[PDB]
Amino acid sequence: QSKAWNRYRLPNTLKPDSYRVTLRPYLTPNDRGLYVFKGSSTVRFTCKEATDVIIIHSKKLNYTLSQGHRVVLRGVGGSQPPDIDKTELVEPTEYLVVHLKGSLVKDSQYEMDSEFEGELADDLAGFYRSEYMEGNVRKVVATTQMQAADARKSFPCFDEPAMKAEFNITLIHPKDLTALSNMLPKGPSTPLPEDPNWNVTEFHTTPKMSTYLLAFIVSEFDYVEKQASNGVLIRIWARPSAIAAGHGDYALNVTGPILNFFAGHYDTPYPLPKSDQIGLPDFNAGAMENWGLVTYRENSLLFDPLSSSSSNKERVVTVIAHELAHQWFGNLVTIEWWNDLWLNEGFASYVEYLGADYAEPTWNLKDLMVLNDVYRVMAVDALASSHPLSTPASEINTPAQISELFDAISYSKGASVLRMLSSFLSEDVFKQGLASYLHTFAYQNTIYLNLWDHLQEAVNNRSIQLPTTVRDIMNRWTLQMGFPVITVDTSTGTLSQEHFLLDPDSNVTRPSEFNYVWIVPITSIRDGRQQQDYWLIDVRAQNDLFSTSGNEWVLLNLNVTGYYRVNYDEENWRKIQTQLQRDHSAIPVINRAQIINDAFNLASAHKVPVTLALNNTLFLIEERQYMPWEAALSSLSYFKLMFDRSEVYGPMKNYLKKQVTPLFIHFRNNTNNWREIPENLMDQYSEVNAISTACSNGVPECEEMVSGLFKQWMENPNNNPIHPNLRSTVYCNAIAQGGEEEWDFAWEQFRNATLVNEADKLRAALACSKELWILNRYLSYTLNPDLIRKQDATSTIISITNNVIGQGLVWDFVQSNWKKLFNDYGGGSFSFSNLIQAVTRRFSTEYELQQLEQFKKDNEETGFGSGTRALEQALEKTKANIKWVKENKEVVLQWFTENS
Amino acid sequence: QSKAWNRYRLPNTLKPDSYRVTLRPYLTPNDRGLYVFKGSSTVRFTCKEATDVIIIHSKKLNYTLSQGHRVVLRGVGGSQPPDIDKTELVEPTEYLVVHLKGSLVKDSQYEMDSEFEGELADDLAGFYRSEYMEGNVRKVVATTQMQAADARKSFPCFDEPAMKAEFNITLIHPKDLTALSNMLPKGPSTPLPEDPNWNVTEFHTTPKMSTYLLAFIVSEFDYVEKQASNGVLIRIWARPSAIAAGHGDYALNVTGPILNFFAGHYDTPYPLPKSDQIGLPDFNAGAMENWGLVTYRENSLLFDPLSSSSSNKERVVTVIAHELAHQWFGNLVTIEWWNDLWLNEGFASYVEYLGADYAEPTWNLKDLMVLNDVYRVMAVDALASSHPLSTPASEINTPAQISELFDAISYSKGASVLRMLSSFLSEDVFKQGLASYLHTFAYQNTIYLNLWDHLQEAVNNRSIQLPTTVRDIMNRWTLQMGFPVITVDTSTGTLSQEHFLLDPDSNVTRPSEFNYVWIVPITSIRDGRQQQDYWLIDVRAQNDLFSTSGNEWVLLNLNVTGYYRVNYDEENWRKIQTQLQRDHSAIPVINRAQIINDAFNLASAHKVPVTLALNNTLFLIEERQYMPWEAALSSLSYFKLMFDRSEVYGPMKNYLKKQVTPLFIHFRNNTNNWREIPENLMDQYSEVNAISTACSNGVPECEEMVSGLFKQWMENPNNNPIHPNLRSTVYCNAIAQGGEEEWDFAWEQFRNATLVNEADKLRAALACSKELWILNRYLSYTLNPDLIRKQDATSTIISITNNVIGQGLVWDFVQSNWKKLFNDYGGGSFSFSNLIQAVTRRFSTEYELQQLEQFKKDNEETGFGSGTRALEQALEKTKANIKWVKENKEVVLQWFTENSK
Ligand SMILES: *[C@@H]1O[C@H](CO)[C@@H](O[C@@H]2O[C@H](CO)[C@@H](O[C@@H]3O[C@H](CO)[C@@H](O)[C@H](O)[C@@H]3O)[C@H](O)[C@H]2NC(C)=O)[C@H](O)[C@H]1NC(C)=O
Ligand SMILES: *[C@@H]1O[C@H](CO)[C@@H](O[C@@H]2O[C@H](CO)[C@@H](O[C@@H]3O[C@H](CO)[C@@H](O)[C@H](O)[C@@H]3O)[C@H](O)[C@H]2NC(C)=O)[C@H](O)[C@H]1NC(C)=O
Ligand SMILES: *[C@@H]1O[C@H](CO)[C@@H](O[C@@H]2O[C@H](CO)[C@@H](O)[C@H](O)[C@H]2NC(C)=O)[C@H](O)[C@H]1NC(C)=O
Ligand SMILES: *[C@@H]1O[C@H](CO)[C@@H](O[C@@H]2O[C@H](CO)[C@@H](O)[C@H](O)[C@H]2NC(C)=O)[C@H](O)[C@H]1NC(C)=O
Ligand SMILES: *[C@@H]1O[C@H](CO)[C@@H](O[C@@H]2O[C@H](CO)[C@@H](O)[C@H](O)[C@H]2NC(C)=O)[C@H](O)[C@H]1NC(C)=O
Ligand SMILES: *[C@@H]1O[C@H](CO)[C@@H](O[C@@H]2O[C@H](CO)[C@@H](O)[C@H](O)[C@H]2NC(C)=O)[C@H](O)[C@H]1NC(C)=O
Ligand SMILES: *[C@@H]1O[C@H](CO)[C@@H](O[C@@H]2O[C@H](CO)[C@@H](O)[C@H](O)[C@H]2NC(C)=O)[C@H](O)[C@H]1NC(C)=O
Numbered sequence A: 001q002s003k004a005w006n007r008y009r010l011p012n013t014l015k016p017d018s019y020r021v022t023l024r025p026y027l028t029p030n031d032r033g034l035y036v037f038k039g040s041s042t043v044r045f046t047c048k049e050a051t052d053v054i055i056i057h058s059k060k061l062n063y064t065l066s067q068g069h070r071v072v073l074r075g076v077g078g079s080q081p082p083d084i085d086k087t088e089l090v091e092p093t094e095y096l097v098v099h100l101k102g103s104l105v106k107d108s109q110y111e112m113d114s115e116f117e118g119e120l121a122d123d124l125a126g127f128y129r130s131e132y133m134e135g136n137v138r139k140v141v142a143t144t145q146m147q148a149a150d151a152r153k154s155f156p157c158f159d160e161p162a163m164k165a166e167f168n169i170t171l172i173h174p175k176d177l178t179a180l181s182n183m184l185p186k187g188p189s190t191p192l193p194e195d196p197n198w199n200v201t202e203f204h205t206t207p208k209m210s211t212y213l214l215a216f217i218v219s220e221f222d223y224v225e226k227q228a229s230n231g232v233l234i235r236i237w238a239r240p241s242a243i244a245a246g247h248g249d250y251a252l253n254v255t256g257p258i259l260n261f262f263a264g265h266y267d268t269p270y271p272l273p274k275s276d277q278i279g280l281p282d283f284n285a286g287a288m289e290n291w292g293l294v295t296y297r298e299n300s301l302l303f304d305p306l307s308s309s310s311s312n313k314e315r316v317v318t319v320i321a322h323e324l325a326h327q328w329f330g331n332l333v334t335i336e337w338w339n340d341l342w343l344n345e346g347f348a349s350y351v352e353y354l355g356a357d358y359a360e361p362t363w364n365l366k367d368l369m370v371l372n373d374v375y376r377v378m379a380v381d382a383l384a385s386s387h388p389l390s391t392p393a394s395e396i397n398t399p400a401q402i403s404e405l406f407d408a409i410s411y412s413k414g415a416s417v418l419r420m421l422s423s424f425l426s427e428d429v430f431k432q433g434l435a436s437y438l439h440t441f442a443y444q445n446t447i448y449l450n451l452w453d454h455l456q457e458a459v460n461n462r463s464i465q466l467p468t469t470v471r472d473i474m475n476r477w478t479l480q481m482g483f484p485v486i487t488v489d490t491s492t493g494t495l496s497q498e499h500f501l502l503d504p505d506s507n508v509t510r511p512s513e514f515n516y517v518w519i520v521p522i523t524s525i526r527d528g529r530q531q532q533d534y535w536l537i538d539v540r541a542q543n544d545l546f547s548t549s550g551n552e553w554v555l556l557n558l559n560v561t562g563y564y565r566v567n568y569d570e571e572n573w574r575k576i577q578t579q580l581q582r583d584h585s586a587i588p589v590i591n592r593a594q595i596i597n598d599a600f601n602l603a604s605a606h607k608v609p610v611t612l613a614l615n616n617t618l619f620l621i622e623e624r625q626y627m628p629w630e631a632a633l634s635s636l637s638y639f640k641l642m643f644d645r646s647e648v649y650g651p652m653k654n655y656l657k658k659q660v661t662p663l664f665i666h667f668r669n670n671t672n673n674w675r676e677i678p679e680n681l682m683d684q685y686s687e688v689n690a691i692s693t694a695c696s697n698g699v700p701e702c703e704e705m706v707s708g709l710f711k712q713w714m715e716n717p718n719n720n721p722i723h724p725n726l727r728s729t730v731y732c733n734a735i736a737q738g739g740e741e742e743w744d745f746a747w748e749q750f751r752n753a754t755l756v757n758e759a760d761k762l763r764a765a766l767a768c769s770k771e772l773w774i775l776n777r778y779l780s781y782t783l784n785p786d787l788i789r790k791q792d793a794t795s796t797i798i799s800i801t802n803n804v805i806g807q808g809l810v811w812d813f814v815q816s817n818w819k820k821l822f823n824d825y826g827g828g829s830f831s832f833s834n835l836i837q838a839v840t841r842r843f844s845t846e847y848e849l850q851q852l853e854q855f856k857k858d859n860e861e862t863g864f865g866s867g868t869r870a871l872e873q874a875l876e877k878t879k880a881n882i883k884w885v886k887e888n889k890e891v892v893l894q895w896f897t898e899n900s
Numbered sequence B: 001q002s003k004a005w006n007r008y009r010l011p012n013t014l015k016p017d018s019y020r021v022t023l024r025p026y027l028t029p030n031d032r033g034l035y036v037f038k039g040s041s042t043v044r045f046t047c048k049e050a051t052d053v054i055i056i057h058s059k060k061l062n063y064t065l066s067q068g069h070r071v072v073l074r075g076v077g078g079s080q081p082p083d084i085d086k087t088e089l090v091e092p093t094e095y096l097v098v099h100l101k102g103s104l105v106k107d108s109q110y111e112m113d114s115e116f117e118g119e120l121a122d123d124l125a126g127f128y129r130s131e132y133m134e135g136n137v138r139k140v141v142a143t144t145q146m147q148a149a150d151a152r153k154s155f156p157c158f159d160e161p162a163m164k165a166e167f168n169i170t171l172i173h174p175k176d177l178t179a180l181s182n183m184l185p186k187g188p189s190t191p192l193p194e195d196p197n198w199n200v201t202e203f204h205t206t207p208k209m210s211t212y213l214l215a216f217i218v219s220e221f222d223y224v225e226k227q228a229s230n231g232v233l234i235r236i237w238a239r240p241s242a243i244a245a246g247h248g249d250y251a252l253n254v255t256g257p258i259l260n261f262f263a264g265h266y267d268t269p270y271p272l273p274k275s276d277q278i279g280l281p282d283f284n285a286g287a288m289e290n291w292g293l294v295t296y297r298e299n300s301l302l303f304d305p306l307s308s309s310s311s312n313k314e315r316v317v318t319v320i321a322h323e324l325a326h327q328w329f330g331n332l333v334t335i336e337w338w339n340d341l342w343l344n345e346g347f348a349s350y351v352e353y354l355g356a357d358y359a360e361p362t363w364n365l366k367d368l369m370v371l372n373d374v375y376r377v378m379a380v381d382a383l384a385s386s387h388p389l390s391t392p393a394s395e396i397n398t399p400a401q402i403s404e405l406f407d408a409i410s411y412s413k414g415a416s417v418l419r420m421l422s423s424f425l426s427e428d429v430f431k432q433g434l435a436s437y438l439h440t441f442a443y444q445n446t447i448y449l450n451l452w453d454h455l456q457e458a459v460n461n462r463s464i465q466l467p468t469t470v471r472d473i474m475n476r477w478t479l480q481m482g483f484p485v486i487t488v489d490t491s492t493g494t495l496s497q498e499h500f501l502l503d504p505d506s507n508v509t510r511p512s513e514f515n516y517v518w519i520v521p522i523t524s525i526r527d528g529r530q531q532q533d534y535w536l537i538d539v540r541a542q543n544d545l546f547s548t549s550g551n552e553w554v555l556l557n558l559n560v561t562g563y564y565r566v567n568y569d570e571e572n573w574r575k576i577q578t579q580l581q582r583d584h585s586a587i588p589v590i591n592r593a594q595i596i597n598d599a600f601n602l603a604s605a606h607k608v609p610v611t612l613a614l615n616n617t618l619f620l621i622e623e624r625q626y627m628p629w630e631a632a633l634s635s636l637s638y639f640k641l642m643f644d645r646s647e648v649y650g651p652m653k654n655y656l657k658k659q660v661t662p663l664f665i666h667f668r669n670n671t672n673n674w675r676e677i678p679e680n681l682m683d684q685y686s687e688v689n690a691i692s693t694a695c696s697n698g699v700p701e702c703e704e705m706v707s708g709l710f711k712q713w714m715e716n717p718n719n720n721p722i723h724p725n726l727r728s729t730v731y732c733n734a735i736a737q738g739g740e741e742e743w744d745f746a747w748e749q750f751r752n753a754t755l756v757n758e759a760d761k762l763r764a765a766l767a768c769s770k771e772l773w774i775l776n777r778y779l780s781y782t783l784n785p786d787l788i789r790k791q792d793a794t795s796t797i798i799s800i801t802n803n804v805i806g807q808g809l810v811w812d813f814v815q816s817n818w819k820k821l822f823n824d825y826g827g828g829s830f831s832f833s834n835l836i837q838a839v840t841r842r843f844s845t846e847y848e849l850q851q852l853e854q855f856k857k858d859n860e861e862t863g864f865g866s867g868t869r870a871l872e873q874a875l876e877k878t879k880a881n882i883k884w885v886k887e888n889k890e891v892v893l894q895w896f897t898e899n900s901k
């Protein structure tokens, strides 16, 4: 608006060099019960272009006028300090405009001192407080989450990733509590000269960081430390009680290997002197890559071996790797602007599994990436509402736009694209370019093009053959949204590409350059033996590689490395099916899951018949791996949700029971009569799946075993015999196969629950009851805050909705008590979006659509709030559901009956 | 409108004298694939008042134009027939108005020849069709059902009960099949001149009768015959296989004696040479009393001693008695209008027990009547939405209202009134008066006043002492709806009477000439010793007969003879509970059941504490008789319907489980490990009650036994180990405690079932499944006429709505397919009301009432027809339920919890 303070982007008039921030957090409420902190900061900025105004980001800061102005300007090195005209604080653009009576000459450093007072509120932003209940005592900790902005809230600073500067952090903390920051403590905490109750801790100057990664936490958390033989001191800080137990031991045992792996992959030594990972009890954000002081949710860093499932073990190892990867890529080489967030977060997501694999080589974690990210993001990208990975930097300005960029696409899509990048570049050449990128751009900001250039330079040195320059071959997958579905005409060995859209009748309004065409790297296998390689340059191309003979099957996207679905002629599909039946080993496990997942998704776009998809699920009877089974069960979930209350459910269960029985018996023998869990994490997951589906479909042995296990627990409570991994499954099936007695025992345990994980497991299991009265009684308990915590109420109601009988109960509940639910819980505590999505997920009939539409008009006056933008979405999904059921019910029903 | 055709009442200007109907039923689909019957008819009518328009009933009949008109007017006796102006067909009133260019000469007989064609569909109305399967060949049987406004569908006629006439019936039927009509065939079947393959059979002229008593059935059914002592030839006609298997043996064993008994009791001879009882595969009503050709559902007539249960045996004898009773009260003497429908249904329902008791003297079915009718109607009669036994004629005009009157009030309330009337007038005096009524108005239509006059004659003849005239005393029980509740102050022995209302806040909009007061006849017993009787003529009275001293307890309405509820003070109730726990035998078995039923209903009306009624159910643990247990289970059903989907259900089940366990074991030992059955009929019913109640509540052995028995039947499909009487409960409980396999086995057996009784049991049991998907599939099956016969469609839906899981499914189904159910399915008006009551018997929340009100607002255009009153009553009950549950949920839960332990 012709005024720099009106503009959302900092003027490039001055750039910071060094910072000195001394903040004293008062973790005790003052007058009006306000937790406030007092801070003093100074910035030695350098005048890049002669100007008359200084603009510094500042949010929720009272400031103190040391002289006639809130700030004091002093020129350094004999620099003349221009007199300050006036001080103004702009809110729309968190800016501290300090108009000066004169112009600051260029090539001269000026320091601006600033004493300020802020509120240590529980906003989970900037400098915030977190109160946890240690025993029966409230304990408050002062932590920091300066993602995107928020850094301004803590102290006056150039809050932009481009503005890199050294930061000297000093914390005045109570003598009892300990203070932590990005760097090591410069000196041991000394009693503050005044009020000896408080100590003063100074930390060594931080390597030129870009803000947003600064962190200063003062608390009483204890810690387990280990000096790695590479020079980095690994310290895992957490609640003293948990550190006293072995909860934090696993993280310390896994951090060292992960750091070493990344050091090699990044070909760079750990930039900071030490690595502290702290487990905050709350911390709604999953994790933060604060340089040196990584903050994690207590549940994602601590692993109790007696009450955490192997799934939690995967969670901690993987999340640790993601943030530890950020320490090299994203902290040493930060993005110039938030528009390139996809490159930073995406790379971290991709190399996350790479690191975890080094730590646990017997888990094959890298394989899970596809099901966890590639297929997850593929579903969203296959909509006409998708956005291109790259966005014009000018477009992103407001803080809200920055937060918007943090989409699942930015993470998974980026990781998938970068995985394809590494595959067609050969990990070795990719790593070479990455190493050069980091070294050449160490301690400075960059654009995604810089990485493309270094990769191309490595391409030339290694002389790898790429159809076009890395930039062009990557622009196709970064400047336009969506992914190509490659159809293979084996008869004439022809290859074709198209923008895959799950809804066939979708108007792709977004005008994408390259007219939605992609340079797809194609890797193929023939009769098991991998062929050479091919790059689809145009929409349609012919190559003998894809040509097949009388009994020849070709399968593209080996290990689904490339972000593209594949469609084949019906003949090739049948050849693949015959191979899967005689020996599934020929097809790599990853591609077996690909076959099932792609078939179902292609059937949704009406590119292949639904029967073909179910045909690709027939070989599961012999499959003993996890990925293939998981893919099929995930896809068949929609079928169950649509036919759970219909006749089709009968034949469907019979078919699934026939397929699961062998897998269940296999595990029963392997686990020695359900006594010893399998070793490989993948096998552990499949064992849980086997029992769950076997009992759900009605395998007799499964229900007998789960019932017996729960009964053994009922006989001897306090010593649960069910192993943590199999607890949720046994609990739900046992309660379902049992009556009021079992539910009563479970309810008692839930009320006496001591660990949140166990409590939530019991809560969901209690909703597995098959008695209408018990479910209604549970619904009444859900609303009561005393019985069910309001934070957990929405999830409990959703869990009852999942019960086939519960669907009707919850639907009447939401339709009749929307007013109460919305009015009493208008706050974010109740996610109405998730609630309405869950209650309307099975809607597949015109009657149900009429009810939902009536609900919309009936409660129109009381805005659905978070529900809005999801209720209209549910209406659209309901309409699509009606069409799908009326177009596939007969075919699906016949298939199950004849194939069961 | 003023237009006579627009009016729903036939003009009195024309009176029918005699008719000649010649229906020809085509038992093969036409080019349009629709079975169609073609017939011609001529009505001889005397012109009571000169008229220029002739109005007759015509329904779904395409009349062939003759002489440029649908009808042809011919002069009888030389009278001139005025020229026909025009013939319009008014559909709303089903009136074929034959406008004339002149006024019919007054007091002149005329004849109207009319040819017509109609659809022989499966609507179970007029001339419909019944398709049964023999071997692998479909067999079609054309039968007639004209209970109300359906004779018009078969032929143009004055379809009103008052318009009696003699009907000459000629049936052109295939030479192979046999034509059955009200009277005997007049001579041998003669070959149709056009086609020898068809036969022309005319029957003897029928005596003066109403159009709704006609029956024309052509069938290949065989029959078993046996002349009765009165000489009337009793023949049981049914499917060839059924008669060959001796399913009709029991029917022939009871029909003859029962018919003679009725004739001897009222000294009135049956005026027809034969009385054929025929069982039709497809029939809506349980049975129709068509004079000479009484029609019955196969379930109500066929009886296989090796597969039918003791209850089935009672059903057959009772139904046959009810229909034979009608042959006197309904056919020989008919009602003037449907307003006094009770005069026929009520008497036939009450005297049915007398006939059954005669045929089966070791059953004591008259004891059951107390719970079968008196208490059954008291529930609906209590609602402020009931109707006086003799509703003003003006209210009942449209055919929908006519069919609506066929409810508990016309049947049970009438029978209960007759029970009380006979009790205070003595059987001898009562039957003497009835004989005069029958002989005086034979072949004539009568009203309630006519009955009172003949009864008064017997009263004076036998010098019976009454407070006032029979008319005044019984007008209180017939001209005002509802029944009185007597408050007994044992402290001072004072009595009072007031209209019993389930909702104390319910607004009665129906005015009463007697201002809701009754000359209640009262009979009281003291410590089991009967005392002198008293008549509560005034609203309030006092007597020492009711005043108690020390620990003396007084029970009014000994053997629930009177039609009223007894409300004792807390003192008497305490003494009664003391007696029940000390020696329940002291209190009459019937009165023990009376105590449980009265206590609960009084509590539901917010007149006594709910705890009091529940307390009265603590003697059940030691009770071994059937009647007490029966009333308790029936009364606690309301609690279940109101708390089955609530937290109270758990404690309630535990309590009942505790009470039934002893009875269950007792019967186990008595039945020798469930191998034998009790000898006494009542004991057999209680044994089945024990097993069903135990399995439903959760007694472990019960669930194990029923499952094992069904498993053994699955092993040997042909040999069913379960004893016929125990099949009902075992089948249901097994299917419920079983899964898809059990449901599949039952479905296959149901489709392959032979005896209707067994098929009915399996059909109802299939609804006991606890799988939502199975119940949804079952509901779709109900609509399919091929899988479930249209006659049993609503019954199956009601069974599904009975299942707790099915309640929601059916409610949404009813809301979604009201238009289809109301239109495609006629339901014969006997249903719909039942379906509405069944789907709305669990409503206890404002949201549920809102849904019901929305249903009415969204389906007012579609119409509720017969269900109109039922839907309106539902609204009243739902509102009362909302208040009752809110005021009693906690106390009911606490009581069960404390007693369950
Ligand atoms: C944050 O801490 C760093 C040190 O870790 C501070 O940088 C230091 O700045 C002072 C001037 O303020 C430098 O002193 C100068 O030393 C040179 C000789 O090296 C001398 O010729 C000059 O006359 C002057 O005394 C000091 O060297 C420098 N230290 C380093 C290692 O660069 C920084 O100023 C602190 N932050 C802020 C905002 O003050
Ligand atoms: C906050 O500052 C206080 C004061 O410095 C710390 O308390 C401890 O103070 C004593 C000196 O008064 C020191 O430790 C003590 O010294 C003896 C030897 O004389 C030694 O055996 C013990 O360590 C003893 O406690 C030390 O300065 C200081 N800290 C320690 C390690 O004891 C207090 O610990 C400070 N709090 C934090 C969290 O840094
Ligand atoms: C900084 O100044 C703001 C604006 O004056 C203060 O905000 C006020 O304080 C109350 C709470 O005590 C807030 O609810 C209102 O937004 C403001 N009201 C008033 C009366 O001014 C803010 O409190 C100050 N900072 C701190 C840490 O206290
Ligand atoms: C974490 O490391 C500790 C050792 O610091 C483990 O304790 C033992 O050490 C070995 C090697 O790590 C483990 O394999 C053994 O299971 C432990 N005991 C023995 C006798 O060697 C500890 O198990 C590791 N994991 C956790 C979760 O604490
Ligand atoms: C029905 O049958 C009767 C008897 O055959 C037909 O004859 C009339 O009815 C009386 C009955 O006793 C006969 O005696 C008379 O000869 C007839 N009466 C008149 C007034 O004609 C009778 O016509 C037939 N019904 C019809 C056509 O109305
Ligand atoms: C109907 O009557 C028949 C014939 O009386 C009954 O069959 C039995 O016939 C044998 C013939 O020797 C007699 O010894 C029995 O006394 C008859 N039993 C009875 C109960 O009468 C038949 O049981 C009767 N009832 C049924 C159900 O058909
Ligand atoms: C119903 O419950 C009992 C009979 O089962 C009646 O008597 C009570 O019994 C309890 C338990 O022994 C005592 O604690 C109470 O004091 C008794 N009642 C009184 C009023 O003393 C009870 O009165 C009945 N409740 C009714 C009829 O409402």
Ligand SMILES: *[C@@H]1O[C@H](CO)[C@@H](O)[C@H](O)[C@H]1NC(C)=O
Residues within 6 Å of the ligand: A717, A718, A748, A752
């Ligand atoms: C709660 O659990 C603890 C630990 O198993 C047990 O000692 C205690 O008795 C339980 N309390 C109740 C009330 O069940």
Ligand SMILES: *[C@@H]1O[C@H](CO)[C@@H](O)[C@H](O)[C@H]1NC(C)=O
Residues within 6 Å of the ligand: B174, B175, B176, B177, B178, B179, B189, B190, B191, B199, B201
């Ligand atoms: C049909 O008529 C013939 C005489 O033509 C007769 O023998 C036969 O029994 C009749 N059939 C029936 C069942 O009416």
Ligand SMILES: [Zn+2]
Residues within 6 Å of the ligand: A287, A288, A289, A322, A323, A326, A345, A348
């Ligand atoms: Zn991250």
